[PDB]
Amino acid sequence: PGRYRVINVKGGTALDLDINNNSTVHGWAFHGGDNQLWDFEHIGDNIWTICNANTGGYLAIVNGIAGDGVKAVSWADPFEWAVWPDENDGSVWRIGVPDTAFHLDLSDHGNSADGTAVQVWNASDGRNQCWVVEEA
């Protein structure tokens, strides 16, 4: 479905599935490889699955239970995300565990460093929780 890149607003790096283990989700400088492209499938009511182009793995969280600092990971099963415009800047998006306050978060204050882990964390104003979803 609609294939998109997902760039962190604060870090400037792409949501990337580690090319070596195909499991760890981290920020990496955008190069346009399939591991940085994500198939957004609309389930309904602006709920989505987000499926890596490289592996077919779905964006999810380790062990499925949302909490502060639970890391993002690739799953063989679908995991549902709410995707909506940020409240302060309508031009960017949040990607969240549905009906929870746990938002997809670029760790270490949205560090631009390649390999910066992506996780979920309680919703804050931080642009490290804001993403640009755009075609590629």
Residue numbers in the entry: 3 to 138
The authors write:
We introduce a new family of fungal protease inhibitors with β-trefoil fold from the mushroom Coprinopsis cinerea, named cocaprins, which inhibit both cysteine and aspartic proteases. Cocaprins inhibit plant C1 family cysteine proteases with Ki in the micromolar range, but do not inhibit the C13 family protease legumain, which distinguishes them from mycocypins. Cocaprins also inhibit the aspartic protease pepsin with Ki in the low micromolar range.
CCP1 crystallized in P21 space group with two molecules in the asymmetric unit. CCP1 has a β-trefoil fold, consisting of only β-strands. The fold resembles a tree with a six-stranded β-barrel as a stem and additional three pairs of β-strands and connecting loops as the tree crown. The three-dimensional structure of cocaprin 1 showed similarity to fungal β-trefoil lectins. Based on the crystal structure, we designed mutations in the surface exposed loops, which were of sufficient length to be able to inhibit aspartic and cysteine proteases. Equilibrium constants were determined for the inhibition of papain and pepsin, which indicated that the β2-β3 loop containing the N22R mutation was involved in papain inhibition because this mutant had an approximately ten-fold higher Ki value. Since the same mutant had a Ki value for pepsin inhibition comparable to that of the wild type CCP1, this suggests that the inhibitory reactive sites for aspartic and cysteine proteases are located at different positions on the protein. Only the N22 mutation in CCP1 significantly reduced its ability to inhibit cysteine proteases, suggesting that the β2-β3 loop is critical for inhibition, which is different from that of clitocypin. The corresponding loop in CCP1 is much shorter and consists of only five residues (Val99-Ala103). It makes a rather tight turn between β strands β9 and β10 and does not protrude from the globular core of the protein, so it is unlikely to be involved in aspartic protease inhibition.
